[PDB]
Amino acid sequence: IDRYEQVSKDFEFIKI
Amino acid sequence: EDVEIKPRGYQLRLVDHLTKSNGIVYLPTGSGKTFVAILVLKRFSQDFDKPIESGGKRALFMCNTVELARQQAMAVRRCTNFKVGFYVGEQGVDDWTRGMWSDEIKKNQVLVGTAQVFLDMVTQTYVALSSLSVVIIDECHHGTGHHPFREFMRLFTIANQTKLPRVVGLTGVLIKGNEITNVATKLKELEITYRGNIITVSDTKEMENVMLYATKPTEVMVSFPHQEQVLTVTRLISAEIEKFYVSLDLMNIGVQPIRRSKSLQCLRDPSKKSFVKQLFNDFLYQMKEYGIYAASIAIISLIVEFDIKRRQAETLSVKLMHRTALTLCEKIRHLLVQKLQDMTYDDDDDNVNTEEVIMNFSTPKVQRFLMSLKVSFADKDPKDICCLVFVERRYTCKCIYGLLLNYIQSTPELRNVLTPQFMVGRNNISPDFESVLERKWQKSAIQQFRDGNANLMICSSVLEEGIDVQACNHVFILDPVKTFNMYVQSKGRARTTEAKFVLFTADKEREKTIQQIYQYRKAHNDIAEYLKDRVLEKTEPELYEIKGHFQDDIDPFTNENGAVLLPNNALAILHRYCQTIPTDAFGFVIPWFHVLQEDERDRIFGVSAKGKHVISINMPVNCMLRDTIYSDPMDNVKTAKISAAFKACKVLYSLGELNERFVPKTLKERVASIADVHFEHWNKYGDSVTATVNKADKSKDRTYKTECPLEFYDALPRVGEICYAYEIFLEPQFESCEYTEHMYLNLQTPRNYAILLRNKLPRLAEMPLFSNQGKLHVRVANAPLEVIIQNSEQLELLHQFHGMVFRDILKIWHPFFVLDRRSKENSYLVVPLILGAGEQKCFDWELMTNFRRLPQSHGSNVQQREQQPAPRPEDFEGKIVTQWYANYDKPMLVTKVHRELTPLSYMEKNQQDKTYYEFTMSKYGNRIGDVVHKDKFMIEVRDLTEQLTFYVHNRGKFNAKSKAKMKVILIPELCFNFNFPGDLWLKLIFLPSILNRMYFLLHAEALRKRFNTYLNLHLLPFNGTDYMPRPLEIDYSLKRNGKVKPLLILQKTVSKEHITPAEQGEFLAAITASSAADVFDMERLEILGNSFLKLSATLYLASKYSDWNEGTLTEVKSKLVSNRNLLFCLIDADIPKTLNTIQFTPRYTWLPPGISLPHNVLALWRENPEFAKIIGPHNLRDLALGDEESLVKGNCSDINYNRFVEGCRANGQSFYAGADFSSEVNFCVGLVTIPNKVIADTLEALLGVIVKNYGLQHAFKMLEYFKICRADIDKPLTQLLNLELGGKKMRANVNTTEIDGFLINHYYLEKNLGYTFKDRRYLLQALTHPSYPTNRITGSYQELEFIGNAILDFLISAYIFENNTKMNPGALTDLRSALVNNTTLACICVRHRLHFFILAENAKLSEIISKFVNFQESQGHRVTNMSTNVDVPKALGDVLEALIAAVYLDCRDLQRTWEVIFNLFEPELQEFTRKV
RNA sequence: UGACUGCUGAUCAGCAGUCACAUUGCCCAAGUCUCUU
RNA sequence: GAGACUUGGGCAAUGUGACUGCUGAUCAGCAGUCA
C-alpha cells in the first residue's frame, strides 16, 4: 500500500 | 491536624460496623476508605501505650505496594499522634536482629510496611497474633490464591483463636479478572477468606448522592477503520530481523545457566539471549500497531537500552551481542527515517509541516487520538487540562510520549498548552532519548502532576491504584480494556465533574467492546444488588466452611518454640537460605529441580503414583545435603514443587541450618554455640568471644606482679643452718694482648667471689658476656661449697659487705634503698672467697672484716702529706687508687710500679722535654703545694671501665685514646689508695650483668622441668637429674647490637629416638622479649609457634566438625589464634610474670637483690595502688636515710615516714597532680607492664620451641595444658595422633570406575604432579568448584582447602626456619607471608598446567582464567618475583591448596606432603630464599 | 418411534500444557554520596 | 562500618490474551443396527 489511508477529517464521539 | 478532617456519616457507620466485627469495606474510589481505616486504628488506642510483655498491643497496618504504603504512612503520620513505624524490605530489614526489632516494635504504636515483610516477621515469632489489636489491609482483591494477603490471613486459624486481632480490608474494586460471571461465589470467597462480611452504602437519597461528589465520568468511544494493507518497510525490517534472530542462535558464546518452562517440560533460552528477542518483538508490535513514526521514535529507545547493556556487559561475548544488536538497530533506524524524510516536505509550514506529516504517517487509531487531542482541549489555558493516557506495553508509554512531544512542538496551538510525561511500572524504563545519564533527576512524574507542572501523563497499568493523583477531567485509553478491575479503576480515575472518559476501538471489533462493557456494567449492578438485597446474615464466623476453604494446601508445619513455616513460603525460605552459601559470584545458588517420569514413579513410590507427579530436588554441592529429597505424589506439578521444597526445607531445619525461627544462620549465630565450647575461660575475665566490645582494648597493655624463682624465694642464709655457696668463674675467651692484660690476668686469679644461698641451685648454662676489651664467658660451680654460719655476727658482717658492694664499689645505690634483712624474694647473698687448704677455698675473712665501709679519699696538702709515712710499693701493687687532685671520682687500678722511675726523671711522653714533678706543680701543685718525695718510685696504673650492661656485641680498638690511657702514671704518695684488691672490684664490675641473667635462667630451667614432667619424658636419661645444660648461643643472624632434604622436625616426628633434651637457653630465648635487647631474641620461634598453632587449631576444628561450611570454620580458626585469646589463655598459666621484657640498667631500671625499699613504705605502696601510682622517683629520692635505719635496722624512721606521706599528699595537688608515675617507679616494687602482643608472641614461642624438638605429636598435649583444644575425653588419642590421621568419613564407602569420566586424562596430572593417588575420591573432591551441578558423588573443595592452607603454611615455615639460618626474623615473617601469597599459589598452579582439570561452570570466571593463562604463557611461566595481569583468579590458588590436602590425606604421610610441596615450590622457593 | 453406534459440528463447563503482556514483592550484590573507623 | 539514590542478578505472587490437549454436559444432523 506504501501509505496510510487518511481517515475522515471528521468523526463522532458517540455516547455509549 | 484532625479538626479539618472531620468525618462524614457514612464513615462513622463504616467504622462502627468494622469495630464490632471483621469486614471488608466497599466504596467507589475517592470515598475516603483509608480515612475510615485511620478512624478504626484510632478506635483501638486503649492498649497502644503498654509494653508487649505487660499486655500492650500494637496496631498493624499493611499494604500491597511500597508507594501506597509510603503515602498512607505520611497520611497517618500527619493525621494521627501515634508514632508511625515503617517496616519494608526496601529499607534494609534483611539483616535485622531481635534487638532493633524489639525496640522498634516497642516504640512504634502503629506499624506500616509491605506484605511479605510482615509475613516473615510474624512467622518468625517477633510478634504473635495475640500481640496485636487491629490489622488493616488495602487492595484486598490482590489477596487471593497464593498472594501474601491470603497467607497472612491463614495464620489467624493456626494461632490462638480467642483474643484474635480485628482485621479489615480496603478496596474499591472487589473482583479481579474476566471471570466475573456468578459474582456470588467470589463474594463468598472474599467474605470468608477475610472472615468478614462486605458492606456498602444502601440509600441513594442520603449516602450515595452525598458520596457521589466523586462523580462518575462520561463514557465516550471513538471508532477507527481497520488497516487494509501492510507496508513494504515493515516486512523488509521483519525479514532482516529474521536473519538477525537466526544469527543470534548461530552466535556461539560461553556456557550459560539452564532455563526451562514453569512446568519443567520445555527447554527455554538463556535470559541474556531472550531479552533481545523480547525487545525486538515489542518493537515489531509497536511498528504494526502505532505507525511507522512510532517505530522511528522507539528505535531510539532500543538504541538507548542496547547502548546501556553494551556499556554494562560483563563479558566480551555479551558486548559482541549487544554491538550486533546496536548495528542492526541503527540500520533499521536509518532505513526507517529515510522514508520519513523522503516526504516530510509536502508544505512550507516547516514545523506545521512536521505536524501534517505525522498525521499522514500515523495509524488510524493514533490519527483519531491526535484529532481528539486537538479538538478536546480547545487550546484553553495549560492549567485547565488534567488528562491521563493508558497503554498496555511499557515501551508504548515512552513511544507515544515522544510522539506527543514531537507533535505538540509541531502544533501551532497545542504547542503552548500541552506537555507530556511517561511513567511505567516498578521495572522503570530509561526515560532518556539519548546516551545514558543525561542529568541527575530529582522530581518524580507523580510529583510533577500533583504540583501542576504537567497536564498530560502517559502511563502503563501502573497508575490504577495506590498513586494519589488529583481528579482528572479527561481520560483517554489507547488499547482495548482487558480486565474488569482495570476498567473500574481507570474509569474511577476521572473523579471530578464533567470528566471525559474516552476509549478507542476498531470498527469490526466495536460490537465486542460494546458487549464487554455492558457485561462489566451488569456485573457491577449485580454486585450492588447482591450487597443491598442479601438476607440479614451475621458476620458469618462459620468455622466449618472456613476450614473447608483452607485444607487443600499442605498442612502448615509449625516446629517447637512456636515458630511456623508456611508451605507457600517454602520456596522463598529455601532460596533465601541457598543464597547464603559462599560463592565466587554465582556459585549455583539455585536448587536444581527435576520431575520424574511414570517409570520412576512406580519404581520408587507407591502404587497410586502413575498419575500424580513426583519431583526430585538436587541441593547444591556446597551444601551437606548431598543426597536428593523426593516430593510427595501430588496432583499437579506446581503443588509437587511446593511439597518438594517444603520437605527439603524441613530436612534442612532438621540439620540445624535454619535457626529456631526458620531463618538461615550466619557466622554471628554459628559462633554463639561454640562460645562456651572453646572460649569459656573468657568468662572469668567477664567478657565473651561474641562480645565485639571486648576487642576495644586490644592495643592497650597490661600490668603484672613479678616474682623471683623458687630457688630465690626465702633463700636467705640463716645462722646455724646449712648454706650452700656457688663459685663464679669469669673465663676470658680471647687472645690476650697488651691492651687486655689488665683484665685478662686479674679475672683468672684463683681468688673469686661466691653466691651463697640456703637453698640448692640447679645446674645452669654458660653465659656469653661482652666486655669492651674482650669476650667473656661465665660459669657457675656445679658442686656448691657448704658451710654453716656459727656466729650471727659473721652473717651480719657479710650482709653489710654485700650492701656496701652495691652502695659504693659499683655505686648502684639510691638514697631510699634499705638493706633487705628479711628472708624473702631475691634475698640471696654474694660472698668473696680466697684459697684455703689445698684445692679447698674458704672465706676471705680479713677482706670482709676490713672493708666494712669504703675508705674516703681525703685531700691531703703537702703540710699534711709531709707527716704521713712514706709510700712503699708493695702496699700499692694490685690495689685501687684515685687521682683526687685532678678529679675526685675516678677509680684507678694499680697494675704495676716503676721503681726505676722518679719524679725528677724526664716525662715519658706529652711533656718529654720536662719532668713529672714540675708537671704536677704546673696544674695541680697550686692546690696541693709541694710533694714529699722527689726521688722515689713511680706507679703505672690503668683505669676501670664505666659500662654497666655488657650484652651488646660491637667491638673495636680505641687506638686514639687507649695508648694515652694505658700510659697514665701517677705519684704514689699523691693519689689516695683504698688498698682494696683490684681483682675483686674488676670481677664485681660485671656482677649485676650476671645476676640478672641467672635470675631468668632459673625461671627458664624451672619451667623446662615442669614442661618435661607434664610430658612424662623427665624420666628419660637426657632429662631429669642427669641433665647437662649447654652454653647459650650467639645470634649472628640478627643485625641489632635429587631427593628433597628431609625436614628435621618431621624426621623426628616419626622416630621418637631422634628427640633431644630441651635446652634451658632455648627456653630463655623464648622468655626474652625483643624489647630487652639481648644477644638472642624470641621472634625466631614466634613464627613457627604461630604456624603450628594455626595448623593444630585447623585440624582440631576439622576433626571436631566435618559438616559445617569452610567460612565459619575459617573465622573460628582465626578467632582461636587471635592474640587476645592467647593473652587470656596465658594469664592463667602464670607465664607473663616469668618473662623478660625490660632493659637492664642497674643504676636506673634494676633493683638490687639484697637491698629493697623500707617494709612500711612497701606496705603503704601495696595497700593503696591509687596512692602508689602518683609517686615519682623524686619523691622517693627526697629523703637520705642514715646508716643505722637504712643498713642495720632495715627500715625508715617515723619522722622520715611522715615526710614521705606529707610530700606525697602535697604532690597530690602539686604540678604533678594527676600525672602518671608508674612508667618508671614500678621496677622498684616488682611490677611491670607488658604488651599483650608480647604475651601472645611468647605463648607461640613456647609452642614453637616444644615443636621443633619434641615433634608435632607431643605439642598437642601442651595445647591441652593451655586448654585451647579442649580434649574429647571419650577419645583423647584422637587429639594426639588422629589429628593428622583424621578428617574423612563414610564418604569414601561409595566408589566406581565412573570417576574417570570426571577426571579426563588425569594421567598427565599424575605425570606433572609426581604423586600417585591410591584413591581418586580426594582429587575429585579437590577439583570440584561449588558452581558445578554435573557431579554429585563427591564434595566441594572448601573443606579440603581448610586443611591444605594450614599444612602448606606449616611446612613452608618449618623449611624456612631450618634452611634459612642467616636472615632476620622481621624479614622472615615477610618471606613467609610472600611464600603463602595467593598470587604465588596461582602462578604455581598455572605453571604446571593445572587449570585444565578444574571442574567449574561459570562463564565470567572461566573468561577470567582464560585471560590469565595466556598472559602467564606470554611471561614464560616465570612470574617476576608479581605480574600486572588483569586480575588473579582466586580459584587457581584455591585448587592447589585443596590438592595439597588431598595428596596428604591420600597417604597420611607428612613426608610425602613435604616432598610434593617442595617439588611444586622448588623454583619459587629458590628465588625467594635468595631475596624476599 | 424407541434403543444404540458411527461420523461431525456447535454451545458450555472444568483441568492441564505452550507463548506473550501487565502489575506487585523478597532476596543477594555492586556504584557513588554522606555519617564515619 | 552506616544513611540516600542509581546500577546488576535470582526467586516467588496476581491477572489477561493467544494456541493446544483432555474430560463432562447440551443442541443438531447424517450413516448404520435392533426393537
Ligand SMILES: Nc1ncnc2c1ncn2[C@@H]1O[C@H](COP(=O)(O)OP(=O)(O)O)[C@@H](O)[C@H]1O
Ligand atoms: N470525612 C472527611 N473529612 C475530611 N477529609 C476527607 C473526608 N473524606 C475524604 N476526605 C479527603 O478526601 C481524600 C480521599 O482520598 P482517599 O482516602 O485516597 O480516597 P479513597 O481511599 O476512597 O480512594 C483524602 O485525602 C481525605 O483527606
Ligand SMILES: [Mg+2]
Ligand atoms: Mg486513594
